[PDB]
Amino acid sequence: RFLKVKNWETDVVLTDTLHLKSTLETGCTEHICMGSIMLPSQHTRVATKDQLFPLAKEFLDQYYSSIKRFGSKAHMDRLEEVNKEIESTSTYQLKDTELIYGAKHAWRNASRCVGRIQWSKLQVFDARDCTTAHGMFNYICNHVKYATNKGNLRSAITIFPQRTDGKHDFRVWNSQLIRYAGYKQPDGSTLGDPANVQFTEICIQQGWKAPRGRFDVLPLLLQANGNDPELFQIPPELVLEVPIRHPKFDWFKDLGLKWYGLPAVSNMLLEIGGLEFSACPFSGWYMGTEIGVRDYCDNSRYNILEEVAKKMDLDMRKTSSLWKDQALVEINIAVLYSFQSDKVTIVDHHSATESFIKHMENEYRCRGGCPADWVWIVPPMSGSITPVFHQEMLNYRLTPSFEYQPDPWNTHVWK
Amino acid sequence: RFLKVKNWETDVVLTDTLHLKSTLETGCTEHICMGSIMLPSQHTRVATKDQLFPLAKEFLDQYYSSIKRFGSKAHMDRLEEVNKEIESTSTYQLKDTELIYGAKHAWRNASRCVGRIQWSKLQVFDARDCTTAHGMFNYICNHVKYATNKGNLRSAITIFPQRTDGKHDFRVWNSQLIRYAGYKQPDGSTLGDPANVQFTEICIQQGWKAPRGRFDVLPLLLQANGNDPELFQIPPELVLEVPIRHPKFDWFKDLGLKWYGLPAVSNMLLEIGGLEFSACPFSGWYMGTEIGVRDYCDNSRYNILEEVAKKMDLDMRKTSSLWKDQALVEINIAVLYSFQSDKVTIVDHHSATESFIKHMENEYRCRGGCPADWVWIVPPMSGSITPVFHQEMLNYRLTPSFEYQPDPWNTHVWK
Ligand code: HEM
Ligand code: HEM
Ligand SMILES: Cc1cc(N)nc(COc2cc(CCN3CCC3)cc(F)c2F)c1
Ligand SMILES: Cc1cc(N)nc(COc2cc(CCN3CCC3)cc(F)c2F)c1
Numbered sequence: 001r002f003l004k005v006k007n008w009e010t011d012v013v014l015t016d017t018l019h020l021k022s023t024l025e026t027g028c029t030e031h032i033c034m035g036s037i038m039l040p041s042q043h044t045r046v047a048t049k050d051q052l053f054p055l056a057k058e059f060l061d062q063y064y065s066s067i068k069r070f071g072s073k074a075h076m077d078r079l080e081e082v083n084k085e086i087e088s089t090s091t092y093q094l095k096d097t098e099l100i101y102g103a104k105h106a107w108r109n110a111s112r113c114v115g116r117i118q119w120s121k122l123q124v125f126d127a128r129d130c131t132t133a134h135g136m137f138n139y140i141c142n143h144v145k146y147a148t149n150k151g152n153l154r155s156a157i158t159i160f161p162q163r164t165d166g167k168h169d170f171r172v173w174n175s176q177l178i179r180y181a182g183y184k185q186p187d188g189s190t191l192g193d194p195a196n197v198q199f200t201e202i203c204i205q206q207g208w209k210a211p212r213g214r215f216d217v218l219p220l221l222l223q224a225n226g227n228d229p230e231l232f233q234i235p236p237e238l239v240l241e242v243p244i245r246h247p248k249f250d251w252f253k254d255l256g257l258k259w260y261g262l263p264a265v266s267n268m269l270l271e272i273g274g275l276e277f278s279a280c281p282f283s284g285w286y287m288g289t290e291i292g293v294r295d296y297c298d299n300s301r302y303n304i305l306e307e308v309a310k311k312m313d314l315d316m317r318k319t320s321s322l323w324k325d326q327a328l329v330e331i332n333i334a335v336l337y338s339f340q341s342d343k344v345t346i347v348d349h350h351s352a353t354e355s356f357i358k359h360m361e362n363e364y365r366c367r368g369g370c371p372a373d374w375v376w377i378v379p380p381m382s383g384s385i386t387p388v389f390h391q392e393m394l395n396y397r398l399t400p401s402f403e404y405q406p407d408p409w410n411t412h413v414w415k
Numbered sequence: 416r417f418l419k420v421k422n423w424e425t426d427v428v429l430t431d432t433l434h435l436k437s438t439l440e441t442g443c444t445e446h447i448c449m450g451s452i453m454l455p456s457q458h459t460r461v462a463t464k465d466q467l468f469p470l471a472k473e474f475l476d477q478y479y480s481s482i483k484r485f486g487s488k489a490h491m492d493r494l495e496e497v498n499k500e501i502e503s504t505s506t507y508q509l510k511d512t513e514l515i516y517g518a519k520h521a522w523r524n525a526s527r528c529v530g531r532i533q534w535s536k537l538q539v540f541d542a543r544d545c546t547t548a549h550g551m552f553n554y555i556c557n558h559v560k561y562a563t564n565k566g567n568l569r570s571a572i573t574i575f576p577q578r579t580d581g582k583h584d585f586r587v588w589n590s591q592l593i594r595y596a597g598y599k600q601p602d603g604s605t606l607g608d609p610a611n612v613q614f615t616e617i618c619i620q621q622g623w624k625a626p627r628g629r630f631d632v633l634p635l636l637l638q639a640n641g642n643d644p645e646l647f648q649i650p651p652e653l654v655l656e657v658p659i660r661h662p663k664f665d666w667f668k669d670l671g672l673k674w675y676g677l678p679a680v681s682n683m684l685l686e687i688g689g690l691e692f693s694a695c696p697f698s699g700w701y702m703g704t705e706i707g708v709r710d711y712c713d714n715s716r717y718n719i720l721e722e723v724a725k726k727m728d729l730d731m732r733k734t735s736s737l738w739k740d741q742a743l744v745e746i747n748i749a750v751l752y753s754f755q756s757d758k759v760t761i762v763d764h765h766s767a768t769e770s771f772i773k774h775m776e777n778e779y780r781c782r783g784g785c786p787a788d789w790v791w792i793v794p795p796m797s798g799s800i801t802p803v804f805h806q807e808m809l810n811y812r813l814t815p816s817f818e819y820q821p822d823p824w825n826t827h828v829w830k
């Protein structure tokens with residue numbers, strides 16, 4: 001088919017033929033839709049040689065087709081050359097160019113990502129020569145420094161060697177390079193970030209000297225070629241942080257919150273031409289809601305709506321006073337304010353969602369489509385006053401892609 | 416299968432086997448998901464006699480199974496009796512009991528409805544004896560009065576005769592029984608409600624004396640047995656309205672807004688046992704966001720975020736001041752306040768979404784499932800601070816159901 005998606009705020013219509021090239025499955029059948037299951041058996045990530053050539057063939061056929069050298073001799077030699085090498089070694093290696101293309105297009109194809117207008121502006125750091133945890137720590141530190149750029153943030157990805165057998169496997173055990181620690185208390189309450197409490201304990205299991213407080217930058221746990229991971233502390237000077245004040249409430253400093261500048265997802269798996277990159281941390285800059293709404297106000301995250309309402313002196317008795325809503329807008333005004341007053345790159349959820357629509361336009365004109373996940377594109381506050389609420393989005397799974405993968409501490413055969 | 420849905424705020428898991436009894440299709444394939452297309456060719460509504468018996472059989476098999484008389488003689492006689500009548504007339508008629516059951520279960524199965532905890536408490540008004548537009552006006556007026564109950568709102572539905580040939584067809588041309596008018600201006604701007612401007616013109620086409628202002632209660636356009644529709648004005652005393660003030664801002668009265676108490680969708684189609692009820696207006700009470708967020712603040716609806724921000728004296732220059740968000744919480748505090756201070760039934764979006772989770776529990780315990788549409792369940796503001804943001808929902812199409820249908824003024828062969 002050649003499906004149509006509509007915007008109901010603007011009566012704009014686009015036509016999607018890109019979904020035809022789609023390959024992977026979604027979890028939805030004809031009789032059930034599953035667009036709200038968080039981690040489906042599809043989106044989560046062992047492969048053989050027979051399976052491997054079509055995936056190389058397909059990938060190389062789009063990559064040459066993109067530089068305007070489709071199916072020619074430079075193409076067919078390269079198809080022959082990897083075909084041969086996949087006979088010989090049963091796997092193969094990517095040209096430096098094929099890696100940059102594959103990486104940028106895994107982001108371009110990430111349907112849950114609102115910020116994809118910047119997909120082509122991605123710095124690829126090739127760390128396929130890495131052998132040790134120390135080498136990983138060094139590539140990662142150089143990633144942080146470059147991406148952070150003293151607050152003028154830049155998108156980057158660092159790609160450690162691809163999985164081979166499966167038991168020799170590079171992994172960053174952190175879910176993000178920079179996260180705050182999470183400790184449980186005597187009464188059972190939680191200090192820091194409740195999300196990471198299990199991870200924080202694994203780091204103490206391996207000998208972390210926790211400064212058992214709130215915003216405690218976790219160390220890195222780096223697994224190299226299947227070996228047992230090792231702890232490393234990012235130099236504090238390389239960890240940029242923003243203290244959250246408000247442009248009205250002088251008591252907002254007293255709240256005493258802060259966040260890190262650099263969102264940098266490290267636990268994902270990067271698929272290119274059938275090869276699997278189990279360590280591939282990637283970074284950009286924050287949309288405000290990801291801190292102000294989710295990090296700070298999720299019930300099982302920092303859960304600050306309590307204290308902020310109290311200090312605003314709010315009708316906190318009734319549910320229908322909307323005191324939760326009132327304090328969520330102020331918390332998000334203060335996150336934005338703080339970040340921009342410190343020259344640290346941040347986008348508000350209005351600006352970013354307007355850009356995604358602009359982006360969808362381009363993707364539909366110059367590519368014939370753009371897979372998008374409305375459940376995840378719409379910002380977690382003020383949904384319908386942002387234009388993506390009113391935009392129909394076809395979700396489908398293209399490749400190259402980022403995929404979820406099981407946490408290594410269940411998989412990793414220890415020793 | 417026997418699928419599992421998770422809540423990620425509470426780590427609660429439910430098992431869904433109800434989807435197995437599902438019948439209709441959703442629009443999603445294995446390779447595409449379409450859970451964000453507004454009106455899919457599925458959800459929109461001509462049927463023959465061969466098709467008709469299985470649908471009667473299936474419906475009667477669940478209805479007797481519910482009163483604890485599954486497949487017995489009272490059952491088999493009734494299956495024989497409608498089978499015979501479907502031979503004879505090629506259609507059939509529903510027992511008063513089968514109509515109440517079918518109606519309540521069309522609501523129970525409406526996966527986009529957040530308020531379904533009250534599905535069993537539904538007043539069914541059987542208007543299948545109606546022959547004229549005047550009879551329709553009278554059934555509808557009695558609906559409004561009963562449902563409104565002087566602000567203590569009650570759920571009701573009024574069911575005009577089922578479609579037969581297709582060209583003799585009862586329709587309420589209004590989309591809701593009570594809506595405000597929409598007129599265009601000289602400069603092209605819009606007074607009233609821009610949604611209805613086409614409808615408002617059709618009513619003036621048929622001779623409405625528009626009081627060309629804002630909150631102008633539209634007249635009813637009633638089509639009876641295929642005949643050309645006729646205009647009727649609900650008695651003003653039967654149209655309950657709530658003037659919107661704020662519990663801080665004395666200037667909020669000066670804004671000069673008001674809304675009607677009774678949400679009452681009239682343009683839907685009710686499917687029961689294979690029979691199609693083209694006129695079936697149904698009502699309950701409002702969730703606040705439906706007025707404060709969508710009606711009042713949609714760009715192509717009343718679009719009041721401008722004036723409210725101005726009066727709050729807001730940093731309206733930058734996008735990232737979040738002035739749009741700030742004025743949306745106040746507008747929604749004032750809608751709730753006003754409605755409850757006037758003893759008119761209204762639910763806030765926190766209260767209603769907590770109830771839907773409680774409801775989902777019951778539906779999964781005592782029925783094995785509950786189809787839900789996350790795109791439409793999550794409230795259009797403060798999504799993630801309400802528990803339905805964190806709840807995975809399987810969407811699937813059961814029957815009896817409400818279905819969309821084309822507007823009659825394109826279909827109706829005039830004269
Ligand atoms: C440029 C600034 C960026 C912004 C503002 C941004 C924003 C977001 C947001 C809000 C989400 C939803 C996830 C959540 O809310 O927790 C997301 C998802 C995602 N983004 Fe982006 N992102 C950016 C850059 C990047 C980069 C550089 C990459 C890859 C190189 C990337 C790939 C992804 C992926 C894979 C997902 C998740 C898809 C899934 O879970 O299946 N993003 N992003
Ligand atoms: C009891 C109070 C009720 C509340 C608070 C409520 C709330 C809602 C909301 C917020 C929606 C989403 C639509 C939108 O936002 O525009 C919805 C949809 C819907 N509701 Fe309910 N509703 C109520 C009663 C009812 C009743 C009495 C019926 C039927 C007898 C019903 C059947 C439906 C249907 C069919 C839909 C739309 C599904 C679709 O578009 O496919 N609801 N409701
Ligand atoms: C580079 C970047 C910039 C930015 N601003 N935000 C992000 C967050 O992206 C991601 C978030 C998650 C976590 C899913 N959530 C935790 C439970 C649900 C997984 C991913 F794979 C992402 F890519 C990334
Ligand atoms: C009884 C009741 C109570 C309440 N509080 N709200 C509603 C609204 O329900 C509905 C809304 C729509 C319109 C869809 N929108 C317009 C463009 C998108 C269609 C339906 F079929 C509904 F049922 C109904």
Ligand SMILES: C[C@H](O)[C@H](O)[C@H]1CNc2nc(N)[nH]c(=O)c2N1
Binds near residue numbers: 038375804806807808
């Ligand atoms: C159950 C549901 O799928 C889950 O809460 C999703 C909903 N949409 C989301 N959207 C974003 N951007 N991030 C999220 O974590 C989620 N969580």
Ligand SMILES: C[C@H](O)[C@H](O)[C@H]1CNc2nc(N)[nH]c(=O)c2N1
Binds near residue numbers: 391
């Ligand atoms: C494009 C999208 O499907 C459309 O805007 C939907 C999204 N979710 C919704 N949810 C509700 N409750 N009401 C709506 O009108 C919509 N609109």
Ligand SMILES: [Zn+2]
Binds near residue numbers: 028033034447
């Ligand atoms: Zn789907």
